[PDB]
Amino acid sequence: IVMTQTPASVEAAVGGTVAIKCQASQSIRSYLAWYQQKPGQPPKLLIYEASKLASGVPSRFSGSGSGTQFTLTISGVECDDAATYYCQRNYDSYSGAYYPNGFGGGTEVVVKGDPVAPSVLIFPPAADQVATGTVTIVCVANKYFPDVTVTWEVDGTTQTTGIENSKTPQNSADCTYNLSSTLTLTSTQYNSHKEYTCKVTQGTTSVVQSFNRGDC
Amino acid sequence: QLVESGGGLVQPGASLTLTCTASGFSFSSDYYMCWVRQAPGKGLEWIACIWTANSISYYARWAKGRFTISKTSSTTVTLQMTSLTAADTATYFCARGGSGDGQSLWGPGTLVTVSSGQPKAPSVFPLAPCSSTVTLGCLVKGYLPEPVTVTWNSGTLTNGVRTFPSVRQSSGLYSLSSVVSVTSSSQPVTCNVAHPATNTKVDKTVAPS
């Protein structure tokens, strides 16, 4: 039996309602479980036997369906609900056992909170990086929503490689993100240029931080 | 509770056995003990379950022939894995379920990293700007495998810490940053960085400017 979840990701406003779908390729009656997983944590059981709430689960979570088509609904979404949700088959008709088994592919829920413009910091590389052969410059975008895009320019030239981005999970209280963007270059490349610029764009708004390799 | 052990860095082609250890209850009671894995940034994937009362076992169609689940005592279940590939890199969880009622109890997971290369210790560099308030931090660069642990002031500094998720660079090495926001009245802030795979322990006090 194949388990399919849709959609892959969905955005929901604080206070809104969002519904998530799980499909089984053959009937599993009511033996379907739902899990919530916050980044960097084990999954937590929300619903078992398709609609029974697990202990300690707030009642804004509900499940429905029996057979092949199931739904998880969040009624009155909260910033805390930013997470990935999975369904799991809990019955095997071949063997007639009720062990918890195959998962659906998961649905990511993004929560639309109140918008907040990012402040931006740039961290020039500590002095002892350069003798290692590579140099990593760090740019941070603090406490913001919705998502940003980051652009690095070196002496005015947009960079298209050496860049990694890491975003903290949405904050349970205010829905905000934080972002760490790194530009990594060889020491030869770093010493060959002067102006290092991090440009953080949020829709039509842009915050820019820059330093010069001689001033630090 | 449940605790997984046995993870670490291994070469493609390796075998490895993980152990799930129970506390506070007994595998001599009737439960399904299962293994579930999750590759970084991907979904949960069921591997296998075993009925602890009689050791009847059930396998995912991709696992049978390559993974073996075993009840080895009243407090341990193992997962033997063979012919490992980079795509088997994942957090491996053990979880307990009953009959038809999901899995309410999970371990924290053990990380298995299947990669070429060898362990590498992190370099730790301070992060500071080139002010009544300032953000400082530590960059933990170029380590393998995960995890590292990063605390501040030995875990007594509370308000205002942001530790970002690690990123695996194209070299296969990881890097992570952690920043802390402080005011001029603050005492110095020290990041405590540990990389158990290489027995690395570094404390770095970060000064403004």
Residue numbers in the entry:
A (entry chain A): 2 to 95, 95A, 95B, 95C, 95D, 95E, 95F, 96 to 211
B (entry chain B): 3 to 35, 35A, 36 to 52, 52A, 53 to 82, 82A, 82B, 83 to 100, ...
Sentences from the paper on this structure:
Neutralizing mAbs 10A, 11A, and 11B isolated from BG505-SOSIP.664-immunized rabbits led to the definition of a highly immunogenic glycan hole (GH) present on the surface of the BG505 Env in the vicinity of S241 (Klasse et al., 2016, Klasse et al., 2018, McCoy et al., 2016). Antibodies specific to this particular epitope were identified as the primary source of neutralization. Negative-stain electron microscopy (nsEM) illustrated that the antibodies approach the Env surface from the membrane-proximal side of the trimer (McCoy et al., 2016). However, given that mAbs 10A and 11A also displayed a comparable loss in neutralizing activity when they were recombinantly expressed as Fabs, we concluded that proteolytic digestion did not have gross detrimental effects. Glycan hole 1 (GH1) class antibodies almost perfectly overlapped 10A, a prototypic GH-specific neutralizing mAb described earlier (McCoy et al., 2016). In our previous study, we showed at low resolution that nAbs isolated from different rabbits targeted the GH in very similar manners (McCoy et al., 2016). Here, in our high-resolution cryoEM analysis, the close resemblance between the averaged polyclonal densities and the structure of mAb 10A, isolated from a different rabbit, again suggests highly convergent responses, even at the molecular level.
Here, we describe a method of characterizing polyclonal responses by using electron microscopy, and we applied this method to the immunization of rabbits with an HIV-1 envelope glycoprotein vaccine candidate, BG505 SOSIP. The target for HIV bnAbs is the metastable envelope (Env) antigen, which consists of the two glycoproteins gp120 and gp41 arranged in a (gp120)3(gp41)3 trimeric assembly and sits on the surface of the viral particle. Stabilization is required for the generation of a recombinant molecule (SOSIP) that mimics the native trimer on the virus, and these recombinant trimers bind bnAbs and are antigenically native (Binley et al., 2000, Sanders et al., 2002, Sanders et al., 2013).
